[PDB]
Every structure is written in C-alpha cells, then in structure tokens.
PDB file of all heavy atoms in Angstrom:
ATOM      1  N   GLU A  11       4.874  -7.040  -6.276  1.00  0.00           N
ATOM      2  CA  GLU A  11       6.154  -6.662  -5.851  1.00  0.00           C
ATOM      3  C   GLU A  11       6.342  -5.122  -5.914  1.00  0.00           C
ATOM      4  O   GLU A  11       6.968  -4.494  -5.100  1.00  0.00           O
ATOM      5  CB  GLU A  11       7.307  -7.357  -6.576  1.00  0.00           C
ATOM      6  CG  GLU A  11       7.455  -8.783  -6.139  1.00  0.00           C
ATOM      7  CD  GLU A  11       8.598  -9.525  -6.853  1.00  0.00           C
ATOM      8  OE1 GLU A  11       9.241  -8.977  -7.779  1.00  0.00           O
ATOM      9  OE2 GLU A  11       8.812 -10.772  -6.484  1.00  0.00           O
ATOM     10  N   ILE A  12       5.801  -4.482  -6.960  1.00  0.00           N
ATOM     11  CA  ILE A  12       5.794  -3.079  -7.073  1.00  0.00           C
ATOM     12  C   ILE A  12       4.850  -2.414  -5.970  1.00  0.00           C
ATOM     13  O   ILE A  12       5.300  -1.529  -5.308  1.00  0.00           O
ATOM     14  CB  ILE A  12       5.410  -2.650  -8.528  1.00  0.00           C
ATOM     15  CG1 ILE A  12       6.401  -3.014  -9.532  1.00  0.00           C
ATOM     16  CG2 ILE A  12       5.192  -1.141  -8.584  1.00  0.00           C
ATOM     17  CD1 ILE A  12       5.860  -3.044 -10.926  1.00  0.00           C
ATOM     18  N   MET A  13       3.677  -2.919  -5.882  1.00  0.00           N
ATOM     19  CA  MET A  13       2.789  -2.393  -4.869  1.00  0.00           C
ATOM     20  C   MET A  13       3.403  -2.457  -3.462  1.00  0.00           C
ATOM     21  O   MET A  13       3.195  -1.579  -2.678  1.00  0.00           O
ATOM     22  CB  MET A  13       1.378  -3.139  -4.952  1.00  0.00           C
ATOM     23  CG  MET A  13       0.555  -2.797  -6.098  1.00  0.00           C
ATOM     24  SD  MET A  13      -1.070  -3.685  -6.036  1.00  0.00           S
ATOM     25  CE  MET A  13      -0.438  -5.216  -5.544  1.00  0.00           C
ATOM     26  N   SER A  14       4.113  -3.548  -3.163  1.00  0.00           N
ATOM     27  CA  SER A  14       4.666  -3.730  -1.914  1.00  0.00           C
ATOM     28  C   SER A  14       5.785  -2.687  -1.599  1.00  0.00           C
ATOM     29  O   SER A  14       6.154  -2.566  -0.353  1.00  0.00           O
ATOM     30  CB  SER A  14       5.320  -5.149  -1.822  1.00  0.00           C
ATOM     31  OG  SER A  14       4.324  -6.110  -1.898  1.00  0.00           O
ATOM     32  N   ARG A  15       6.314  -2.011  -2.507  1.00  0.00           N
ATOM     33  CA  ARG A  15       7.224  -0.846  -2.219  1.00  0.00           C
ATOM     34  C   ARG A  15       6.539   0.271  -1.512  1.00  0.00           C
ATOM     35  O   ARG A  15       7.204   1.063  -0.767  1.00  0.00           O
ATOM     36  CB  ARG A  15       7.916  -0.313  -3.473  1.00  0.00           C
ATOM     37  CG  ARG A  15       8.653  -1.335  -4.340  1.00  0.00           C
ATOM     38  CD  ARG A  15       9.715  -0.699  -5.162  1.00  0.00           C
ATOM     39  NE  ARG A  15       9.218   0.269  -6.130  1.00  0.00           N
ATOM     40  CZ  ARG A  15       9.152   0.068  -7.474  1.00  0.00           C
ATOM     41  NH1 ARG A  15       9.518  -1.088  -7.936  1.00  0.00           N
ATOM     42  NH2 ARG A  15       8.731   0.965  -8.221  1.00  0.00           N
ATOM     43  N   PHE A  16       5.205   0.371  -1.654  1.00  0.00           N
ATOM     44  CA  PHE A  16       4.543   1.501  -1.120  1.00  0.00           C
ATOM     45  C   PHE A  16       3.914   1.321   0.266  1.00  0.00           C
ATOM     46  O   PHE A  16       3.877   2.178   1.123  1.00  0.00           O
ATOM     47  CB  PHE A  16       3.469   2.010  -2.094  1.00  0.00           C
ATOM     48  CG  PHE A  16       4.043   2.479  -3.359  1.00  0.00           C
ATOM     49  CD1 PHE A  16       4.353   1.673  -4.402  1.00  0.00           C
ATOM     50  CD2 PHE A  16       4.225   3.851  -3.579  1.00  0.00           C
ATOM     51  CE1 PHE A  16       4.837   2.081  -5.593  1.00  0.00           C
ATOM     52  CE2 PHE A  16       4.742   4.340  -4.746  1.00  0.00           C
ATOM     53  CZ  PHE A  16       5.089   3.459  -5.762  1.00  0.00           C
ATOM     54  N   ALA A  17       3.467   0.124   0.526  1.00  0.00           N
ATOM     55  CA  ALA A  17       2.756  -0.188   1.748  1.00  0.00           C
ATOM     56  C   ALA A  17       2.513  -1.655   1.879  1.00  0.00           C
ATOM     57  O   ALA A  17       3.021  -2.454   1.091  1.00  0.00           O
ATOM     58  CB  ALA A  17       1.425   0.485   1.790  1.00  0.00           C
ATOM     59  N   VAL A  18       1.868  -2.050   2.953  1.00  0.00           N
ATOM     60  CA  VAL A  18       1.504  -3.371   3.314  1.00  0.00           C
ATOM     61  C   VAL A  18       0.328  -3.865   2.399  1.00  0.00           C
ATOM     62  O   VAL A  18      -0.680  -3.145   2.477  1.00  0.00           O
ATOM     63  CB  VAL A  18       1.165  -3.536   4.806  1.00  0.00           C
ATOM     64  CG1 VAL A  18       0.430  -4.880   5.068  1.00  0.00           C
ATOM     65  CG2 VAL A  18       2.416  -3.538   5.593  1.00  0.00           C
ATOM     66  N   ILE A  19       0.503  -4.896   1.684  1.00  0.00           N
ATOM     67  CA  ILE A  19      -0.536  -5.398   0.680  1.00  0.00           C
ATOM     68  C   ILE A  19      -1.086  -6.720   1.279  1.00  0.00           C
ATOM     69  O   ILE A  19      -0.370  -7.554   1.864  1.00  0.00           O
ATOM     70  CB  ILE A  19      -0.087  -5.542  -0.734  1.00  0.00           C
ATOM     71  CG1 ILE A  19       0.577  -6.880  -0.919  1.00  0.00           C
ATOM     72  CG2 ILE A  19       0.844  -4.349  -1.065  1.00  0.00           C
ATOM     73  CD1 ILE A  19       0.814  -7.162  -2.428  1.00  0.00           C
ATOM     74  N   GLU A  20      -2.403  -6.915   1.078  1.00  0.00           N
ATOM     75  CA  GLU A  20      -3.040  -8.227   1.207  1.00  0.00           C
ATOM     76  C   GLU A  20      -3.502  -8.671  -0.177  1.00  0.00           C
ATOM     77  O   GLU A  20      -4.296  -8.091  -0.804  1.00  0.00           O
ATOM     78  CB  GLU A  20      -4.224  -8.152   2.125  1.00  0.00           C
ATOM     79  CG  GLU A  20      -5.014  -9.486   2.126  1.00  0.00           C
ATOM     80  CD  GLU A  20      -6.237  -9.442   3.039  1.00  0.00           C
ATOM     81  OE1 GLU A  20      -6.422  -8.435   3.773  1.00  0.00           O
ATOM     82  OE2 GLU A  20      -7.001 -10.428   3.046  1.00  0.00           O
ATOM     83  N   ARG A  21      -2.789  -9.844  -0.672  1.00  0.00           N
ATOM     84  CA  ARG A  21      -3.210 -10.393  -1.918  1.00  0.00           C
ATOM     85  C   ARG A  21      -4.676 -10.861  -1.891  1.00  0.00           C
ATOM     86  O   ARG A  21      -4.996 -11.743  -1.046  1.00  0.00           O
ATOM     87  CB  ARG A  21      -2.291 -11.492  -2.256  1.00  0.00           C
ATOM     88  CG  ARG A  21      -2.442 -12.057  -3.696  1.00  0.00           C
ATOM     89  CD  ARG A  21      -1.795 -13.457  -3.746  1.00  0.00           C
ATOM     90  NE  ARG A  21      -1.628 -13.942  -5.106  1.00  0.00           N
ATOM     91  CZ  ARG A  21      -2.497 -14.759  -5.719  1.00  0.00           C
ATOM     92  NH1 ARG A  21      -3.593 -15.208  -5.095  1.00  0.00           N
ATOM     93  NH2 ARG A  21      -2.258 -15.132  -6.933  1.00  0.00           N
ATOM     94  N   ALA A  22      -5.561 -10.265  -2.642  1.00  0.00           N
ATOM     95  CA  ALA A  22      -6.920 -10.686  -2.617  1.00  0.00           C
ATOM     96  C   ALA A  22      -7.301 -11.655  -3.754  1.00  0.00           C
ATOM     97  O   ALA A  22      -8.185 -12.435  -3.580  1.00  0.00           O
ATOM     98  CB  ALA A  22      -7.838  -9.517  -2.628  1.00  0.00           C
ATOM     99  N   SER A  23      -6.622 -11.569  -4.887  1.00  0.00           N
ATOM    100  CA  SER A  23      -6.834 -12.520  -5.957  1.00  0.00           C
ATOM    101  C   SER A  23      -5.513 -12.546  -6.796  1.00  0.00           C
ATOM    102  O   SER A  23      -4.526 -11.820  -6.455  1.00  0.00           O
ATOM    103  CB  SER A  23      -8.032 -12.206  -6.768  1.00  0.00           C
ATOM    104  OG  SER A  23      -7.838 -11.134  -7.671  1.00  0.00           O
ATOM    105  N   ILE A  24      -5.541 -13.195  -7.916  1.00  0.00           N
ATOM    106  CA  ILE A  24      -4.382 -13.110  -8.808  1.00  0.00           C
ATOM    107  C   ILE A  24      -4.162 -11.712  -9.379  1.00  0.00           C
ATOM    108  O   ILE A  24      -3.027 -11.406  -9.806  1.00  0.00           O
ATOM    109  CB  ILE A  24      -4.549 -14.135  -9.987  1.00  0.00           C
ATOM    110  CG1 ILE A  24      -3.187 -14.437 -10.637  1.00  0.00           C
ATOM    111  CG2 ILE A  24      -5.537 -13.636 -11.038  1.00  0.00           C
ATOM    112  CD1 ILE A  24      -3.243 -15.645 -11.633  1.00  0.00           C
ATOM    113  N   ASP A  25      -5.145 -10.922  -9.344  1.00  0.00           N
ATOM    114  CA  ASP A  25      -5.020  -9.640  -9.970  1.00  0.00           C
ATOM    115  C   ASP A  25      -5.380  -8.451  -9.146  1.00  0.00           C
ATOM    116  O   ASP A  25      -5.489  -7.318  -9.587  1.00  0.00           O
ATOM    117  CB  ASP A  25      -5.683  -9.513 -11.334  1.00  0.00           C
ATOM    118  CG  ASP A  25      -7.166  -8.943 -11.179  1.00  0.00           C
ATOM    119  OD1 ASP A  25      -7.851  -9.432 -10.299  1.00  0.00           O
ATOM    120  OD2 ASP A  25      -7.485  -8.101 -11.985  1.00  0.00           O
ATOM    121  N   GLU A  26      -5.620  -8.654  -7.805  1.00  0.00           N
ATOM    122  CA  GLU A  26      -5.892  -7.471  -6.951  1.00  0.00           C
ATOM    123  C   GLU A  26      -5.332  -7.641  -5.596  1.00  0.00           C
ATOM    124  O   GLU A  26      -5.085  -8.800  -5.145  1.00  0.00           O
ATOM    125  CB  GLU A  26      -7.369  -7.191  -6.899  1.00  0.00           C
ATOM    126  CG  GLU A  26      -8.163  -8.079  -6.108  1.00  0.00           C
ATOM    127  CD  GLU A  26      -9.514  -8.403  -6.650  1.00  0.00           C
ATOM    128  OE1 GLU A  26      -9.611  -9.079  -7.725  1.00  0.00           O
ATOM    129  OE2 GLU A  26     -10.570  -7.852  -6.168  1.00  0.00           O
ATOM    130  N   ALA A  27      -5.169  -6.549  -4.921  1.00  0.00           N
ATOM    131  CA  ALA A  27      -4.655  -6.514  -3.559  1.00  0.00           C
ATOM    132  C   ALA A  27      -5.199  -5.272  -2.834  1.00  0.00           C
ATOM    133  O   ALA A  27      -5.364  -4.198  -3.385  1.00  0.00           O
ATOM    134  CB  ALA A  27      -3.095  -6.415  -3.655  1.00  0.00           C
ATOM    135  N   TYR A  28      -5.459  -5.489  -1.578  1.00  0.00           N
ATOM    136  CA  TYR A  28      -5.884  -4.352  -0.735  1.00  0.00           C
ATOM    137  C   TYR A  28      -4.489  -3.833  -0.120  1.00  0.00           C
ATOM    138  O   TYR A  28      -3.439  -4.494  -0.025  1.00  0.00           O
ATOM    139  CB  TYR A  28      -6.756  -4.756   0.417  1.00  0.00           C
ATOM    140  CG  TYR A  28      -8.114  -5.196  -0.062  1.00  0.00           C
ATOM    141  CD1 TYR A  28      -8.298  -6.544  -0.416  1.00  0.00           C
ATOM    142  CD2 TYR A  28      -9.219  -4.290  -0.154  1.00  0.00           C
ATOM    143  CE1 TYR A  28      -9.582  -6.975  -0.854  1.00  0.00           C
ATOM    144  CE2 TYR A  28     -10.429  -4.721  -0.607  1.00  0.00           C
ATOM    145  CZ  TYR A  28     -10.644  -6.006  -0.986  1.00  0.00           C
ATOM    146  OH  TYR A  28     -11.843  -6.463  -1.421  1.00  0.00           O
ATOM    147  N   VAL A  29      -4.518  -2.562   0.291  1.00  0.00           N
ATOM    148  CA  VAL A  29      -3.372  -1.922   0.816  1.00  0.00           C
ATOM    149  C   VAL A  29      -3.852  -0.922   1.961  1.00  0.00           C
ATOM    150  O   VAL A  29      -4.808  -0.223   1.743  1.00  0.00           O
ATOM    151  CB  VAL A  29      -2.624  -1.137  -0.245  1.00  0.00           C
ATOM    152  CG1 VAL A  29      -3.479  -0.615  -1.244  1.00  0.00           C
ATOM    153  CG2 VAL A  29      -1.745  -0.102   0.290  1.00  0.00           C
ATOM    154  N   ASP A  30      -3.126  -0.983   3.107  1.00  0.00           N
ATOM    155  CA  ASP A  30      -3.436  -0.086   4.230  1.00  0.00           C
ATOM    156  C   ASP A  30      -2.439   1.069   4.127  1.00  0.00           C
ATOM    157  O   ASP A  30      -1.230   0.930   4.400  1.00  0.00           O
ATOM    158  CB  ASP A  30      -3.323  -0.839   5.545  1.00  0.00           C
ATOM    159  CG  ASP A  30      -3.992  -0.071   6.682  1.00  0.00           C
ATOM    160  OD1 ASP A  30      -3.798   1.143   6.794  1.00  0.00           O
ATOM    161  OD2 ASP A  30      -4.733  -0.700   7.467  1.00  0.00           O
ATOM    162  N   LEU A  31      -2.962   2.267   3.736  1.00  0.00           N
ATOM    163  CA  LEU A  31      -2.134   3.367   3.579  1.00  0.00           C
ATOM    164  C   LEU A  31      -2.076   4.305   4.804  1.00  0.00           C
ATOM    165  O   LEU A  31      -1.462   5.380   4.668  1.00  0.00           O
ATOM    166  CB  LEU A  31      -2.616   4.193   2.334  1.00  0.00           C
ATOM    167  CG  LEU A  31      -2.588   3.371   1.035  1.00  0.00           C
ATOM    168  CD1 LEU A  31      -3.440   3.866  -0.120  1.00  0.00           C
ATOM    169  CD2 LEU A  31      -1.147   3.386   0.570  1.00  0.00           C
ATOM    170  N   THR A  32      -2.657   3.899   5.925  1.00  0.00           N
ATOM    171  CA  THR A  32      -2.728   4.812   7.058  1.00  0.00           C
ATOM    172  C   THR A  32      -1.398   5.401   7.439  1.00  0.00           C
ATOM    173  O   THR A  32      -1.214   6.630   7.430  1.00  0.00           O
ATOM    174  CB  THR A  32      -3.374   4.064   8.311  1.00  0.00           C
ATOM    175  OG1 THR A  32      -4.558   3.447   7.871  1.00  0.00           O
ATOM    176  CG2 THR A  32      -3.669   4.992   9.377  1.00  0.00           C
ATOM    177  N   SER A  33      -0.383   4.556   7.578  1.00  0.00           N
ATOM    178  CA  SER A  33       0.953   5.001   8.021  1.00  0.00           C
ATOM    179  C   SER A  33       1.524   5.898   6.931  1.00  0.00           C
ATOM    180  O   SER A  33       2.086   6.988   7.252  1.00  0.00           O
ATOM    181  CB  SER A  33       1.880   3.745   8.194  1.00  0.00           C
ATOM    182  OG  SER A  33       1.661   3.175   9.530  1.00  0.00           O
ATOM    183  N   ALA A  34       1.587   5.446   5.611  1.00  0.00           N
ATOM    184  CA  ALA A  34       2.167   6.254   4.619  1.00  0.00           C
ATOM    185  C   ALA A  34       1.495   7.621   4.475  1.00  0.00           C
ATOM    186  O   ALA A  34       2.158   8.595   4.309  1.00  0.00           O
ATOM    187  CB  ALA A  34       2.093   5.536   3.274  1.00  0.00           C
ATOM    188  N   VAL A  35       0.098   7.699   4.683  1.00  0.00           N
ATOM    189  CA  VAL A  35      -0.580   8.981   4.655  1.00  0.00           C
ATOM    190  C   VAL A  35      -0.036   9.858   5.726  1.00  0.00           C
ATOM    191  O   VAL A  35       0.263  11.046   5.554  1.00  0.00           O
ATOM    192  CB  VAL A  35      -2.055   8.728   4.740  1.00  0.00           C
ATOM    193  CG1 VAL A  35      -2.694   9.956   5.201  1.00  0.00           C
ATOM    194  CG2 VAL A  35      -2.648   8.390   3.362  1.00  0.00           C
ATOM    195  N   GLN A  36       0.016   9.371   7.004  1.00  0.00           N
ATOM    196  CA  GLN A  36       0.502  10.046   8.128  1.00  0.00           C
ATOM    197  C   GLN A  36       1.836  10.735   7.858  1.00  0.00           C
ATOM    198  O   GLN A  36       2.082  11.970   7.914  1.00  0.00           O
ATOM    199  CB  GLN A  36       0.643   9.112   9.363  1.00  0.00           C
ATOM    200  CG  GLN A  36       0.002   9.675  10.589  1.00  0.00           C
ATOM    201  CD  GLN A  36      -1.463   9.570  10.613  1.00  0.00           C
ATOM    202  OE1 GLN A  36      -2.055   8.567  10.893  1.00  0.00           O
ATOM    203  NE2 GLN A  36      -2.083  10.646  10.128  1.00  0.00           N
ATOM    204  N   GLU A  37       2.898   9.899   7.415  1.00  0.00           N
ATOM    205  CA  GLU A  37       4.187  10.426   7.246  1.00  0.00           C
ATOM    206  C   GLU A  37       4.232  11.393   6.062  1.00  0.00           C
ATOM    207  O   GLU A  37       4.981  12.390   6.087  1.00  0.00           O
ATOM    208  CB  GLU A  37       5.219   9.254   7.100  1.00  0.00           C
ATOM    209  CG  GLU A  37       5.070   8.295   8.237  1.00  0.00           C
ATOM    210  CD  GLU A  37       5.948   7.019   7.942  1.00  0.00           C
ATOM    211  OE1 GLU A  37       6.628   6.957   6.957  1.00  0.00           O
ATOM    212  OE2 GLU A  37       5.794   6.051   8.739  1.00  0.00           O
ATOM    213  N   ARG A  38       3.540  11.116   5.024  1.00  0.00           N
ATOM    214  CA  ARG A  38       3.406  12.023   3.868  1.00  0.00           C
ATOM    215  C   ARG A  38       2.780  13.322   4.184  1.00  0.00           C
ATOM    216  O   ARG A  38       3.070  14.324   3.463  1.00  0.00           O
ATOM    217  CB  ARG A  38       2.655  11.263   2.714  1.00  0.00           C
ATOM    218  CG  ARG A  38       2.616  12.026   1.421  1.00  0.00           C
ATOM    219  CD  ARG A  38       3.965  12.001   0.729  1.00  0.00           C
ATOM    220  NE  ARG A  38       3.769  12.577  -0.574  1.00  0.00           N
ATOM    221  CZ  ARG A  38       3.561  11.878  -1.686  1.00  0.00           C
ATOM    222  NH1 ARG A  38       3.519  10.529  -1.639  1.00  0.00           N
ATOM    223  NH2 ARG A  38       3.232  12.554  -2.781  1.00  0.00           N
ATOM    224  N   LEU A  39       1.933  13.336   5.284  1.00  0.00           N
ATOM    225  CA  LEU A  39       1.274  14.564   5.688  1.00  0.00           C
ATOM    226  C   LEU A  39       2.202  15.605   6.347  1.00  0.00           C
ATOM    227  O   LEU A  39       1.985  16.819   6.189  1.00  0.00           O
ATOM    228  CB  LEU A  39       0.054  14.319   6.602  1.00  0.00           C
ATOM    229  CG  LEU A  39      -1.269  14.181   5.886  1.00  0.00           C
ATOM    230  CD1 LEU A  39      -2.288  13.341   6.763  1.00  0.00           C
ATOM    231  CD2 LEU A  39      -1.835  15.574   5.679  1.00  0.00           C
ATOM    232  N   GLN A  40       3.186  15.165   7.075  1.00  0.00           N
ATOM    233  CA  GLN A  40       4.155  16.089   7.731  1.00  0.00           C
ATOM    234  C   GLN A  40       5.160  16.524   6.694  1.00  0.00           C
ATOM    235  O   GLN A  40       5.552  17.752   6.681  1.00  0.00           O
ATOM    236  CB  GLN A  40       4.875  15.430   8.895  1.00  0.00           C
ATOM    237  CG  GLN A  40       3.936  15.117  10.059  1.00  0.00           C
ATOM    238  CD  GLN A  40       3.809  13.621  10.266  1.00  0.00           C
ATOM    239  OE1 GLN A  40       4.552  12.813   9.745  1.00  0.00           O
ATOM    240  NE2 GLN A  40       2.770  13.200  11.026  1.00  0.00           N
ATOM    241  N   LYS A  41       5.616  15.641   5.753  1.00  0.00           N
ATOM    242  CA  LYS A  41       6.611  16.042   4.781  1.00  0.00           C
ATOM    243  C   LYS A  41       6.009  17.044   3.839  1.00  0.00           C
ATOM    244  O   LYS A  41       6.741  17.911   3.289  1.00  0.00           O
ATOM    245  CB  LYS A  41       7.072  14.827   4.054  1.00  0.00           C
ATOM    246  CG  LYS A  41       6.730  14.814   2.478  1.00  0.00           C
ATOM    247  CD  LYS A  41       7.938  15.046   1.651  1.00  0.00           C
ATOM    248  CE  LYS A  41       7.769  14.523   0.229  1.00  0.00           C
ATOM    249  NZ  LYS A  41       7.552  13.066   0.140  1.00  0.00           N
TER     250      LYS A  41
END
C-alpha cells in the first residue's frame, strides 16, 4: 500500500513487487 502511492505495482510475491516508473520519471523531470 505504501509502494502504490508512488506508481503502478505488480505484486510478484509476498515480499516483492515490480513498479513501472516511466510516467513518474517523466513528470519528475520537468518539475
């Protein structure tokens, strides 16, 4: 639930998740 505040997560196991940061990186780059 914390990780989901930052980006779209894919739950990969009970203790890990992938995250696609492409969008957040884009917007963070102009700011």
Side-chain angles (χ1 to χ4, degrees):
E11 286 179 356
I12 294 159
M13 285 181 318
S14 294
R15 306 204 297 253
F16 295 83
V18 161
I19 85 168
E20 173 179 355
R21 188 199 193 263
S23 76
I24 199 170
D25 92 313
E26 75 216 72
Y28 298 86
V29 34
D30 197 315
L31 296 159
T32 309
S33 279
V35 159
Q36 229 73 86
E37 305 170 8
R38 186 69 174 270
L39 263 158
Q40 295 113 16
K41 118 108 159 296

